Design a protein around this ligand. Structure first.
Ligand SMILES: O=C(O)c1cccc(C#Cc2ccccc2)c1-n1cccc1
Lengths: 141, 134
């Protein structure tokens, strides 16, 4: 496998290679004729830097997907203090979303991310992922 | 002190008044939501502020940006990270049944206004395993 100068690669490149290896196990549909964005993977936690690396590596590994920027999650029960109404207050936990054209590929990618981060030290192993579904799709521009 | 956000909240409340479905569960888990996008950045912001006031039981992301979809023609397709000028936010909810009601209310609310407000789009979404908001 390719090795960068001095015997190392950037974290996002190694993520891409790990994802490629896991995804090669699954020959599931990634696109449809209609090309609608009906499924997704919602990825959060860890730390901002770990999600940054994961997001960059996901894009490198999967041309068939589309990604949001990194953003932040609100709180669950009992939000922290702030001048805005509770529903708007931002935690320090970050997230990003992956949009996909098939529900099965979302499942495969969710499982790949879970398997990959379990091999990394904290905080990367604390990244969480769930598949999501969009009833009417998302009409990406 | 914020008449614009309060007016949006009042309009949403009037539409939501027609339903009495449960907005919370004993489990308390964030399993459904609405994904709101388009319009303009400012119109989405204003809706987000009004939603927070009308629905204390929801949680909201900040505004963010959508990537591009498919490009017509033989290529090139956009890279997965490319960002468009179209914004979105997510509403997290404890029940799918109320997600459906909120989707209908947002659609009915924004169609009463001129562009760009009326170009706001909304779809129900679901999270297979929930989202463990902190
Ligand atoms: O600021 C925006 O663009 C905007 C975004 C979303 C919703 C509204 C509204 C409304 C509404 C409020 C009361 C009754 C009927 C409709 C909105 N808005 C408010 C004034 C002009 C536009």
């Amino acid at each position: 496998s390719h090795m960068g100068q001095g015997g190392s690669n950037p974290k996002f490149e190694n993520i891409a290679e790990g994802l490629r290896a896991l995804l090669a196990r699954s020959h599931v549909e990634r696109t449809t004729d209609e090309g609608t964005w009906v499924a997704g993977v919602f990825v959060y936690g860890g730390s901002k830097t770990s999600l940054y690396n994961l997001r960059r590596g996901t894009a490198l590994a999967i041309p068939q997907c589309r990604l949001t920027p990194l953003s932040r999650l609100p709180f669950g029960m009992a939000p922290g203090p702030g001048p805005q109404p509770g529903p708007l207050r931002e935690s320090i936990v970050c997230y990003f979303m992956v949009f996909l054209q098939t529900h099965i590929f979302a499942e495969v990618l969710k499982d790949a991310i879970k398997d990959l981060v379990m091999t990394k030290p904290a905080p990367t192993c604390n990244i969480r992922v769930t598949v999501c579904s969009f009833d009417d799709g998302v009409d990406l521009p």
